[PDB]
Amino acid sequence: MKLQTTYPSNNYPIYVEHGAIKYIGTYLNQFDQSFLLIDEYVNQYFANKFDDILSYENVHKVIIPAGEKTKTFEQYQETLEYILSHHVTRNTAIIAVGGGATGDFAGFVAATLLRGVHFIQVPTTILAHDSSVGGKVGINSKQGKNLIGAFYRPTAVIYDLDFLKTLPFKQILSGYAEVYKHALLNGESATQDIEQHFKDREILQSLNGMDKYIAKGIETKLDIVVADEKEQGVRKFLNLGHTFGHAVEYYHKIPHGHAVMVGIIYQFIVANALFDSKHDISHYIQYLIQLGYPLDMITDLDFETLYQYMLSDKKNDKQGVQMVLMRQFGDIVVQHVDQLTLQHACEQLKTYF
Ligand SMILES: NC(=O)c1ccc[n+]([C@@H]2O[C@H](COP(=O)([O-])OP(=O)(O)OC[C@H]3O[C@@H](n4cnc5c(N)ncnc54)[C@H](O)[C@@H]3O)[C@@H](O)[C@H]2O)c1
Ligand SMILES: O=C(O)[C@]1(O)C[C@H](CP(=O)(O)O)[C@@H](O)[C@H](O)C1
Ligand SMILES: [Cl-]
Ligand SMILES: [Cl-]
Ligand SMILES: [Cl-]
Ligand SMILES: [Cl-]
Ligand SMILES: [Cl-]
Ligand SMILES: [Zn+2]
């Protein structure tokens, strides 16, 4: 499946298929130099496959910390200064081989090096089906997730589904949060169409039919980022369950997708309090449990603390916290939520556990 952005100009292709790794060849041959920024762990799993391309040496490897460890200024400055010592040209390319963390970090590097160089997205995670699309890139700050970054369109997005076969369940859970999130944004018939498929851990962990739902998430996103690239409108909906997700993630250092799931439930609880949406909270929580989501940690969730991180959410305004809420399927709204409401939403979510 080959998709592609449809902006007035400067568009990129999104190759999503098994073995898509074959498309990298053409690109590598078009650049003066290329820097393969690869995840520390991902490096171990696939170093072999790269030892070849890393022979013609105008192609270099840059091993970075795995996961969130890489999204920091220090790693950013270190990496930038390192590449620059190669006397690079503007016709260089930063190839991000890894998950959203690698993509975000390497993307920010591509976006700033000489004010901008070529950027190839090489997603290796399920979750990365969401992150490798949209041009949003960046690193974290002491005040929270993704506070420094940019909107930088990659040159291409090469998604070789074979990469998924090696994902442990923890990652399958983390990455499913995004897939599911896209189902929620696609309405009731879509949300149940996926709950009836990935009913339990057995099916999820098998990844059967995951491809279908991944392409579905990528399509749901492509349209949203093409319609509202700089997130001035509907793209904000993609942040569903991220106001609390990002707060829980940064403070508790748990997997990104896991945090999103907690935030989604939180988002529902808030919706019930503000609109009396009658969201079956027990329904959503049962589904997580069955999928294998830990969710024990929350037993020590300090709202007072988390609120500080939510107070940095890039969705906020002068009034304060702005959340993406599902008043009900098909009816998503973006609005301010007072800390009184938010605080009760957290005390209640905690209660369930
Ligand atoms: N910019 C965006 O559009 C966007 C969208 C979604 C989420 N994100 C960001 O993306 C990150 C989360 O995504 P992620 O799950 O890909 O993070 P990640 O980069 O941390 O990858 C998860 C883990 O899987 C390992 N891994 C990578 N590919 C593997 C493979 N094929 N087999 C086995 N292990 C593999 C990694 O080493 C890592 O430990 C967060 O930093 C989040 O803020 C950004
Ligand atoms: O606009 C987007 O692409 C997102 O809303 C961007 C967020 C990250 P942000 O809120 O730090 O931009 C990402 O986690 C979400 O799944 C998709
Ligand atoms: Cl444009
Ligand atoms: Cl094209
Ligand atoms: Cl040169
Ligand atoms: Cl492979
Ligand atoms: Cl809107
Ligand atoms: Zn996310």
UniProtKB/Swiss-Prot annotation:
Cellular component per GO, a single term: cytoplasm
Entries under InterPro entries matching the protein: Dehydroquinate_synthase, DHQ_synth_AroB, DHQ_synth_fam, DHQS/DOIS_N, DHQS_C
Enzyme Commission number(s) from the entry: 4.2.3.4
Compartments where found: Cytoplasm
Cofactor note: Binds 1 divalent metal cation per subunit. Can use either Co(2+) or Zn(2+).
Keyword Glycoprotein: no
Required cofactor names: NAD(+); Co(2+); Zn(2+)
Binding site for NAD(+): 39, 45, 68-71, 100-104, 124-125, 136, 145, 163-166
Uppermost EC category: lyase
One Pfam family cited in the UniProt record for this chain: DHQ_synthase
Gene Ontology process terms (BP): amino acid biosynthetic process; aromatic amino acid family biosynthetic process; chorismate biosynthetic process
Pathway: Metabolic intermediate biosynthesis; chorismate biosynthesis; chorismate from D-erythrose 4-phosphate and phosphoenolpyruvate: step 2/7
Positions that bind Zn(2+): 178, 242, 256
Principal location class: cytoplasm
Swiss-Prot/TrEMBL keywords: Amino-acid biosynthesis, Aromatic amino acid biosynthesis, Cobalt, Cytoplasm, Lyase, Metal-binding, NAD, Nucleotide-binding, Zinc
GO MF terms held by the record: 3-dehydroquinate synthase activity; metal ion binding; nucleotide binding
Catalytic activity: 7-phospho-2-dehydro-3-deoxy-D-arabino-heptonate = 3-dehydroquinate + phosphate
Task performed by this protein: Catalyzes the conversion of 3-deoxy-D-arabino-heptulosonate 7-phosphate (DAHP) to dehydroquinate (DHQ).
PANTHER family (UniProt xref): 3-DEHYDROQUINATE SYNTHASE, 3-DEHYDROQUINATE SYNTHASE, CHLOROPLASTIC
Similarity-based family: Belongs to the sugar phosphate cyclases superfamily. Dehydroquinate synthase family.
Protein name as catalogued: 3-dehydroquinate synthase
Organism expressing this protein natively: Staphylococcus aureus (strain MRSA252)
